[model samples]
Target: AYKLVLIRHGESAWNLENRFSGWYDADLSPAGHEEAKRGGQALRDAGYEFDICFTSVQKRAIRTLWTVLDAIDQMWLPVVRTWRLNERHYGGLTGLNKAETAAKHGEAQVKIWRRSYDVPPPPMEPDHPFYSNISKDRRYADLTEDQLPSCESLKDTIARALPFWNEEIVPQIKEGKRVLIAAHGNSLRGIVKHLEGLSEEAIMELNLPTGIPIVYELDKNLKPIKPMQFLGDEETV
Candidate 1:
């Protein structure tokens, strides 16, 4: 059976600091790097190999993918990088510490901002001194003002990512190619929500651990034959 694997990138400095990473880019922490290697080993041990790789434009996901490919000896595989797979933009709260924000806004308010599937947080102004400023970057320069996001809910992320899944990823799976996607928590969760037909409440319970490969075997219609399998120790995550 052909496989489709999804792996969230390992933790970043912001993750360690309990901050909102949003589109902030950072390298993997030491433990995060080790997790990436271990994830690759888990896939290898499970005898999984892939033909194509997909990752976001961000560094943490990209580096994690590099390590996974290195471990599986598939560094030369065609890797497609797309901004559509990038992390959900956190808007004005991008670089703020989670606890700090919560302390100021109250736990209940922060919880809604963080977990409400369809509700986006307060937006970042483009002229903010240190937040939501991707427009001038070379990578996103081609995108129009309408395409830029100052804040994104999980629903928004799904809308942004669905076209890529339908136009690019769906065809590959139908062709029996083994595919791997390296992405962020919300982006990966968005795809999972679509594949599993999860509801808003159901999607809230899903917290994909970083640097772990989730394996799925699709049937003729591209439905998973059974439940998706987590390559690493299932309980640890």
Candidate 2:
């Protein structure tokens, strides 16, 4: 059986503020650091090791991966960082407070924006304060103009992410490398939905808790051989 582990980045400063983090560069909170440590400790204690790692270029994910590697004493591990794995762009809603937005737009409309499989939020304006964050970042300098996203639905996220998975990650897994992916909630959800063949409705309702490592044992076909699980002592905390 081949093993794969996926972890959503720990809580961000924006998450603590109840803001829509989207593509904004939110750093990990103090508690987020501890959460990353706990996840790594859990993996190490469970005798897990990795051959390769992957993460988004976003700081929260990259930092979580860094902390995880440090905890496992695997700082030398190879990591492939890519924007394809970044969180879904929140469009016009980028840095808005989640609660206040819901209050203004009504919870039903916010839910559709937040959880719908294909309905993207309104496009980010060219003059939006957050629009230039990604556009100006050197990490995404290689992205062609067409590749830069102003907004994205889960469907849009999967469209971008799955190609990378098929071309890069799947081959590595086939080579018998144990893989660990640290990414955002929506990105990871897109991956998991693809891996598990979940329907759109099911994927919409799926919520991954931050900082938990999800372990999946897959067969030669890359289909899961057993139910996915969290790698941790869930009983106490």
Candidate 3:
């Protein structure tokens, strides 16, 4: 059996501010760093070891993975970073405070933006600060104009995430390597939806909290043989 470990990055500064981070590059707060270390410690204590690691292009996830690898003394493992693993783009809602946006748009509308599977928020303008800077970044310099996503619904996120799973992650599992994925809530949800064969509607109900490591054991066909298991003592809200 091959093992898969999925982890959402530690709490970020934007997470502390209750903002929609989307693909924004934010650093971890002090508490966020502590949480990341704890997540690594939890994995170490559970005796988990990985042959390879994966993360999104965003820094929050990257930073968390770095801390986790440091804690486990696995910094030498190969890491694959791709935009396919990036967080769901928040579109026009990027950088907005959750409570303030809820007050302005009403909670229901905000909920739809946050939770609706196919309905993406308003698309971010090409000239918007986030897009303008990201477009010129060296990491994306090789991307064809059409290859990049300006904004993404959860459905859009799933479209990108699954291809990577099929092409990159699954083959590694087939080769008998333990793999670890460090990503965002929505991105992980997209992967979980595929791994568990959850319906589109059912996926909306799944919520992943930050800094938690979930383990899955899969059989030869790459189907999960055990239920998704969370590694933590306290119940998350």
Candidate 4:
């Protein structure tokens, strides 16, 4: 059997502010960095070793992976960065604060925008400050049309995430290499929805808190051989 561990990035500045971060590049809070280190310590305490590490293009997730690897002294592992693993794009809602957004749009609307699977928020205008800045970033210069996802709902995230599972992650697991995925909440939910075959509506109720790891073991055929497992303190939720 091969092991796969999935983790959401440590709490970001936006997360602390209760803002809609979407694909925006945000750094971790100091406490968030500590949480990430703790996650790595938890893994090390369990005697886990990863052959490969995967993370989203977002700096928050990438940085969390870096801290985790540093804590475990596994910084030398091969790492793969992919847009497919990015947080669910929040479209026009990116960078908006929760309470302020709720004041403008009302709480119910904000909740729907945040939770509904098919209901995407307003699309980000191509010339909007956020969209324009990201397009000019040198890091994204190598991205192709198919790999660049500008606006996404939970459903859209699922569509993008599953293809990568079949095409990239599964092959490594089948080869018996322990694979670790460090990504965002919605992206990991996309994987959970697929692994458990949950309905889109059902997925809406599943929330993965940041800075905790979930482990899954798969048989030779790549089917999960055990129920989803969580690591770290039981207080994690």
Candidate 5:
């Protein structure tokens, strides 16, 4: 059997403001930083340690990993950051105030955009205010225009994320590395939904609390065996 630890990054500024973060590169709020430390401390008290780690290219996720690694004295562990692990893109709604959007677009339509599995929010035009200029961003320079995302749904996120899981992450897991991943809500949701074989409706109902370490025990075939436990909340997990 093998173990995987998945932790969503702590809260961001947008989280408090109730806005659509969606690859907007918002920094973590003060409480979020504290939450990362708390999560790290919890792992340390539990005697949990990781070998290699994973994170998104975004700062919030990266800093969360740093805090956890510091707490466990695993700061030297190799951390792999990838764009594929980024939060689900919010499209034209990126960086918009969630409440205001709901008020303007009607709560029902906003709910559909927020929860629908296949229905993506409106696509982001190149001239949109919130669009990140990947061409000038040196970190993503190697990736082609088609590789970058302007907008994406849960299904779209899963498509890009699953390949990275199957290729880079799976090989390491098969080799028995204690894997730790600090990522965003939707990205991890895609993974959990896929691993749990949840239906579309079920996936919509799944909610991942930030900064909690969820442990999954997988068999040799990579199938989870009654897994999904919160590290400190073992009983609740």
Candidate 6:
């Protein structure tokens, strides 16, 4: 059997503002930083140790991983950072206040954009306020035009993320390395969707709270032996 853990990055500044932060590179809130460390401490207290770890290149996710590793005193662990693990690209919704956007676009339309599996929000223009910053980032400089996203549905997000799981992560898991993945909600959900054979509709209702570690035990063939466990209760806001 193999052990795997996944934690969505701690709550972000945009999360506090109720904005669509997808690919916008929002920084962590002070509480978010504390949340990350708390998550790490929980793992340490539980006697968990990972051989290797993974996270997205985005600062919020990367910082979450850093604090987690720091709390665990496992900063020496090898970590692979990849763009594929980034959050679902919000396209035109990037940086927009969620409630305000819902007022402009009907609530149903916004809901569809937010929760539907195959429907992407309006595609982002090249001159989108955040486009230049994201597209020009050095980490994504190697990507081709086709590889970059204008907008992405959850289905689209899964399309990109599954390859990384199958090729990079699963191999390491099969090698018997304990694994921890710190990533954004949608990206981490993509992994859960794959691992649990969740239907497209079922995935829309799934939400992973920030900074909580979800643990899974898998049999030799990489299927979960039972339902995953959460290390802590999320009571009180």
Q: Candidate 3, overall lDDT?
A: 0.83
With candidate 2 superimposed using the best TM-score fit, by how many Å does residue 90's alpha carbon deviate from the native?
A: 0.8
**Where does candidate 1 stray beyond 4 Å?**
14-17, 127-129, 233-237
- Candidate 1 lDDT over 67-126, as tens digits, reads 999989899999999989988887777777767788766899887876688899878776
Give the distance in Å from residue 230's predicted Cα in candidate 4 to where it truly belongs: 1.6
What is the clash count for each candidate, in the order shown?
0, 0, 0, 0, 0, 0
Task: Tell me the spans in candidate 4 whose CA falls farther than 4 Å from its real position.
Answer: 14-17, 106-108, 144-147, 234-237
lDDT of 5 by residue, 82-184 (tens): 9989888877777678677787679899988877888888877777666555324666677787877778888998888888888888899999999999998
lDDT of 3 by residue, 49-164 (tens): 89999999988889889988988889999999998998887776777777767876788888777667888887777766677766577787787887676778889999989999
TM-score of 3: 0.91
Candidate number with greatest TM-score = 6
Question: Model 1 shows how many backbone clashes?
Answer: 0
Error of 3 at 207 (Å): 0.9
Please give, for residues 77-178, the per-residue lDDT of candidate 2 as tens digits.
999998989998878777888776777678899977766788988888888788877668788888998888889988998889888888999999999999
Clashes of 5: 0
lDDT of candidate model 1 versus the reference: 0.82
TM for candidate 4 is: 0.90
What value does the lDDT take at residue 197 in candidate 2?
A: 97
For lDDT, candidate 2 versus 3, the one ahead is 2
N/CA/C clash count, model 4? 0
- In order, what lDDT does every prediction score? 0.82, 0.86, 0.83, 0.81, 0.83, 0.86
- List the candidate 5 regions with Cα displacement exceeding 4 Å: 14-17, 132-136, 233-237
Candidate 5: pairs in clash: none
RMSD of each: 2.0, 1.7, 2.2, 2.1, 2.1, 1.8
Distance from true location, Cα of 199 in model 5, Å: 1.2
Stretches off by above 4 angstroms in model 2 are 14-17, 103-108
